[model samples]
Target: SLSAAEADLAGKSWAPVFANKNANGLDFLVALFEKFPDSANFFADFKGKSVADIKASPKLRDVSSRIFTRLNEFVNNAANAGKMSAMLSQFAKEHVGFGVGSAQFENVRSMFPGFVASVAAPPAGADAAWTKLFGLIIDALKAAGA
Candidate 1:
């Protein structure tokens, strides 16, 4: 369960970044692909594309939008464990079928704070709160065998 303070911080911190989903979300995904190049292989359409090309692809923009939307949903509903769990579980199941495993999720978990920091720059304790929030979501994904 998210603490009240954590939930408040997460909602307040992420809402604006996600509000500008196109630019910020693309930036986040570009950073992710740069950090973990092989992750692009998970997407059939992006598998062999160069980083620059991948960044320019409309498909990638769509993906970025979806990613931002989901995170926005999670952040908005941070205090609702049931809603969060159900959403994460659904994500886990979908990704599992795409051959995503714990390691990839861990890679995202490892790098995501930096991504958030770059794009949102959540204040002091809020960064840690976001980390903890991601940890909780990742735990749910792992529990679901993602």
Candidate 2:
């Protein structure tokens, strides 16, 4: 079972950032692509772009916004294991062919915790909570045999 305590913290922490999806999502994804430059190779709009270029790209903002919306839904729904499992399984299916390499998931999880903490005025335990959330996501992704 996902820890409700962690779920509580993650949902609470993400609320503020999730409210303003436009800028915050862009900020987070920009940081992600910057931190792991190779991750951008998987993105059509970002492939030939620099980090600054990526930051300026409108398509990237749409990507960032959609990503944030999905993840916000992810943490918000953490209390339901069945829903979470289904979500991740579906997510795994959607991300195929384009590539879901070890590094892609690993790289996002790597950047996500601190990113949330920094932007959201996150609580003390938000790091562990977000980590736990991604742990479930990763497990379910692989659980789908993806």
Candidate 3:
């Protein structure tokens, strides 16, 4: 269910700065999806669709983008590290609402390394990029309930 929700959020919504059409948000997403051959079919479903369709609902898109951007900010800034556990706790709780359990979190986490590897293959810096991406994600988790 969390995957479904993530897919839903990734499908059509837009954020102010993060999802702006001119900002190449969709391009970044497409690129990421392109790297994950397993995910290509899923992403291909959005081909030829409008930005709104690729993003999902406008409201959801904004929220997802804000959450993602906020995580990115945390990774770049390396703010508070103490709040990480609590943030992860909240995420776990939220995922439970999506019918996911603690056991499922590993699967979610595993996807990231592969995603990063995919991106890195093209530009050769994907490992570093994903390292930063993971940092952002982890930092954001801490900040969520900080």
Decoy 3 TM-score against native: 0.37
Task: Give one digit per residue, the lDDT tens place, for model 3 in 1-146.
Answer: 11333322322122222334333434445444444433332333544554445556343345445546644443333333445445555664564454434332233344544533333332344334444434444444444432
**How good is model 1 by TM-score?**
0.90
Name the Cα RMSD for model 1.
1.6
True-structure Cα RMSD, model 2: 1.6
**Candidate 1 vs candidate 2: which has greater lDDT?**
1
**Residue 95 lDDT in candidate 1:** 79
lDDT by residue (22-81, candidate 1, tens digit) is 899898888888989989899887898988999779798889888888888888777888
TM-score to native of every candidate shown: 0.90, 0.90, 0.37
Alpha-carbon shift of residue 87 in model 2 (angstroms): 0.3
How does candidate 3 score on lDDT? 0.40
Order of the predicted models by lDDT, top scorer first: 1, 2, 3
Report per-prediction Cα RMSD to one decimal: 1.6, 1.6, 11.3
Which candidate, 2 or 3, would have the higher TM-score against the true structure?
2
Error of 1 at 136 (Å): 2.0
| Candidate 3, residue 111: how far the Cα is off, in Å | 6.1
